Design an enzyme around this catalytic site. Structure first.
Site, PDB file in Angstrom:
ATOM      1  CD  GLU A 283       3.953   0.949   6.758  1.00  0.00           C
ATOM      2  OE1 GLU A 283       3.792   1.513   5.656  1.00  0.00           O
ATOM      3  OE2 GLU A 283       4.670   1.428   7.664  1.00  0.00           O
TER       4      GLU A 283
ATOM      5  CG  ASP B 293      -0.276   0.103   2.522  1.00  0.00           C
ATOM      6  OD1 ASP B 293       0.667  -0.677   2.759  1.00  0.00           O
ATOM      7  OD2 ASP B 293      -0.677   0.952   3.346  1.00  0.00           O
TER       8      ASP B 293
END
Ligand SMILES: [Cl-]
Ligand SMILES: [Cl-]
Lengths: 361, 92, 352, 341, 341
Positions: free
Chosen positions: A126, A73
């Protein structure tokens, strides 16, 4: 499912271009995960999404495991994906699809000894969220024997851990008056705490060229108000700590620096560090030098998965990946193509070197 | 104002202290400190910085006449923070 | 003109609810080139009409989206953009098909891009109902999947809970505004959950959504405001839900606004039968769905009392999401299915 | 001992519009403390003082807040002017004096409440009592019934907000739409209530404010509407109707309370009637047009409940709100006789 | 390779009013990155791309922000319309193209800056350069000089705010006081500047807004005034004058910069003159009425400095701001010849 390709065929630049093309801000990593799992399956991994939707691809066999823990991500927004003059522009090129791409390729190139597994993870959520990815791994998996965190360290840099973080709040209340002398108002009092604390931090870390071995303060917010009887002021300060300055130490200085005000403190991150002499560090120092580099031991300032799986598993751990971390979360985030393949070669050796240590046992 | 917090206890300090029979070799210091209530206790902090630690301390706070306070509870300020992607769902 | 192309331009013009004019302008400009008489109505609704006659088929979609922009790009066959699914995708399909459909005589084809559908107002739809007389057929422009057809949507109510708490000294017993507002949410959440036990489909559930909860302190009075969306199944009227919500508040102040009650159409209805038949005619296997959110379908359905369904390509689960997207092929796939469906419904209408 | 009149001007001289009751409450409690009540403000800021001892409780629930507007506090030939002289510091002061004057049996405690925010829609002063207190055995609401009047009930209340948006281009203005909504609402209520004798049984909408504005690209208009409901028309029903007349705009609704009424032959009514009658009065039982905290504590607690106090309710919220000082002395003595029985 | 014209419409098509430059800056940097600049935004949000290598630096300082107002972006027979076509995306685009086109000696690096907030009083885009960068050896300001024009200077700028309060009772209105203040200020400047040839040497006040309001018990009025200063009248002096005319109200002042001018016989001027002349032009040296970031970086850095770019400055801030596309190609080539020398 695609036909099996050569791990040597696909370059990291090739994989990264495809990976950086697919949008994947935190929470919306599903298309990116599916794509990467297919790619990994083609490279000899057994790849499939786990419970939290993390991309997971495994190699090798045995009771020992080297996990390469990266994240898929990014922050939102599209850096216009383009390759110009040997530089790849794109969101996540540095933070952290570059390191993730390196993980995938180097992991498939690396020669493994018997009894050693290799798990590559493209974790989710994250960047903007509370790391559902890594927390799921901890809750569902056994602690691996070694962990490499996919964060930009530079191809010729190796990250041993992270600096401690402390959030300070100074608050002061003083009766209103007409005076204009020094320390007449709460705002002046709050401002001067900043100066004297800012001064101390500079005093403490004088001449230190290793920035991560310095204590550097930050005035995030200063506010003041009054009810006509009393004036109040609050200064919110962040303190990034070197390993030799514990929070409670720094918190004691701040407390001692304040007289008319009161200082409260939150420790955001305890400092954390794998020692320089440790085998995993020896492996990476050796790996960098083996491919013509002068390795630099460093610490990450910003938080990462290293802040979680580190304290959880307690296993030997480093962070490695190509790219300049100063470019994290930037509108023109980019990485040179040379650094990608160079870091890929280095990590390939490092995985072999760590697996060699583990197999020797 | 201050009948309970804390001029009452302070008044009691003054009177009882002057009534109390003292044995030899014992001092008795009664203090009406300033800036405790709204400010950062310039009073007590000054005492610490300028005086020797006494051998016993009675704090002038309301305990009730038939109550005695041994200390204070610990305090913790918590902050919970969460970030989630937007969607259309209305589930839990 | 291709559907994916129009959408690619359509999704490039930001049109959050209440700021639709630029997109509305551009769309009216495009529909004329396709044969429509295009003009923004008194509300700002993009309206394209073609043909004439006693009858009318309205393709009612919406041009507005929720805020937060998804960087517009096409990758690996998929188009990324705000409103690509909800619902500029279905609207683009509406436009292309309507000008592509072979129109019988005595039939009007109206294509509407409504404003402010994504908000409590539905200002565009309410304007249509107030100023226009009923169509003979309405197709709702929402994502159903190109192989799916939507029969209905839940109703909705908007709640605001307000409460203020002063300062005695009771830092222990008599307590905070944020606590009182959180107390209200728990009560409502609990009630809805108790009502909804065992029910598998959200459409037949009552579900609250705490969109916002904010407290403040000025030194004098503390205040807390909760903004809540109540999604309603048929079995629970807006009046009853609001009455329930009002009764749950102990010391606070509950404020309520009704959008619409739940609305659904029987699968035994001809228009449903057509669209099921429409999808099979292009290699599809049609599915009937009842959805979680609310629609302008819940307004124009009752007000006009005409046959009505929702159809549009895209994954409605991607509604309001940071990377809302739709595969380019589904567009023309739904465009073909829709072009067919329009030509056939027009026949049944002409037939009587 | 202090008369109700000396108590009233002191309270009236202290402005307490809804939201700003603290100094009035603060001052009232010391007046209650000086008079012998155990008195402090509660968690919501209500002025609370309680008498007697035991498990049985009579509550004198008045309110200390007023509507805004400065009415010059003065006495003109035995007539006291001032905001709150009638609504409702007069009744509240009467509660404080008659509440102390009366003598109670053992086990019976009396409590005087100067609630906050009764005048506005929140009514959170009373709502805090419902949340934090046990139900008393009886309640007297502090509203102006007249010295020889007994109020048995009030109409319900629902506040309505209409908002409409129109583009500042081409095609009804925001003002016109809002006005026509009012026209529809006003007509619906008038046709419903046609030929009904008293205000209590009619449904009456109140256009408190209508304001149109130009956003820039949009025309905007808002209408603040108060709606007063009879027993026959519930808040729920009235909102459904209001919703059905919205058309192009949206209606936002906030329920205060349904209508409430005390049954005419109650023992608590007889007690006040006697207190009125035995004090040489000719009582008229009244049902009032406005609303009250009675409408909340009534359905909540269920105990015997009435409204009593000096003052003519027609003077409520007026620029020269006033009460004859003579009315104060009688109302105090009458409430006392009532309290005892 | 991309022409200045294809670059201009792309930039003009991206709205960037002061405060909202990020998407324009973001897009411009990738255009600079695609063209080969090391390019990212800096700490203040300026669009920055730099060329060459070494310790010697030429800076092409333009600005990417514009005044508000939507000017429809279109080409009508070789004429490009759009907000920023003249002020000052035209010059900025010219900087990006001519800046890459030119060939540099070793040790000489070129840097292109699309600063934020030049149009407004903050000028913080340029101020961030002054704070975070070493002084370059020369600067070219990106303002429309005309393809055959060389701007040597701009007037200074001070913004003034007059606020006056009057009770809403009995005895001059807030509006009248504010207007008379303007009358005094306007007259003082007109009598000072009487009979002066060009705008550069005159002091000219600008009444951008005057608004009177009714507080409720007070009458209020505010006047937003921009003041353009010649070299002879400093910001300091002009504020003292403004202060002396306040009377019943107060004047709030914010200094942008004093006037600035480049000396006519500078080598950097000769370089541009030649570039103009050798490219078949008849150069006219100009001094402009408005202000620029030149007025800040000039006195700060002290290096040789001029303003150059395509566009007629009279079209600045106009509803149909436009520039002939022909002017773009010449200005790019001329700037190049100028850059080399
Ligand atoms: Cl009647
Ligand atoms: Cl001159």
């Amino acid at each position: 499912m695609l036909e099996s390709i050569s791990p040597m065929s696909m370059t990291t630049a090739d994989l990264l271009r495809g990976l950086v093309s697919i949008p994947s801000p935190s929470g919306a990593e599903a298309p990116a995960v599916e794509w990467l799992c297919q790619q990994m399956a083609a490279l000899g991994y057994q790849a499939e999404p786990d419970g939290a939707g993390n991309a997971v691809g495994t190699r090798g066999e045995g009771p020992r495991e080297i996990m390469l823990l990266g994240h898929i991500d990014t922050v939102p927004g599209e850096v216009p994906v383009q390759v110009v003059d040997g530089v790849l522009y794109g969101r996540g090129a540095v933070d952290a699809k570059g390191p993730l791409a390196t993980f995938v390729v180097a992991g498939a190139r690396a020669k493994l000894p018997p009894g050693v597994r290799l798990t590559v993870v493209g974790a989710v959520e994250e960047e903007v969220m509370s790391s559902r990815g890594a927390r799921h791994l901890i809750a569902t998996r056994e602690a691996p024997d070694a962990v490499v965190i996919g964060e930009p360290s530079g191809w010729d840099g190796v990250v041993l851990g992270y600096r401690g973080s402390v959030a300070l709040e100074y608050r002061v209340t003083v009766p209103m008056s007409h005076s204009a002398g020094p320390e007449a108002t709460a705002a002046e009092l709050a401002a001067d705490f900043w100066y004297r604390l800012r001064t101390w931090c500079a005093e403490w870390s004088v001449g230190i060229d290793h920035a991560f071995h310095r204590v550097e303060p930050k005035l995030n917010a200063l506010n003041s108000s009054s009810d006509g009887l009393y004036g109040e002021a609050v200064a919110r300060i962040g303190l990034r700590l070197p390993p030799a300055l514990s929070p409670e130490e720094a918190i004691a200085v701040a407390t001692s620096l304040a007289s008319e005000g009161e200082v409260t403190a939150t420790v955001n991150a305890p400092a954390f560090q794998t020692d320089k002499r440790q085998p995993i560090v020896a492996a990476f120092l050796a790996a960098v030098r083996a491919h013509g580099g002068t390795p630099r031991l460093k610490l990450k300032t910003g938080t990462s998965d290293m802040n979680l799986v580190g304290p959880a598993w307690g296993c030997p751990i480093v962070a490695y990946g190509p790219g300049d971390s100063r470019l994290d979360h930037t509108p023109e985030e980019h990485v040179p193509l040379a650094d990608l393949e160079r870091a890929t070669a280095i990590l390939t050796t490092a995985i072999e070197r760590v697996a060699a240590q583990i197999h020797s046992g």
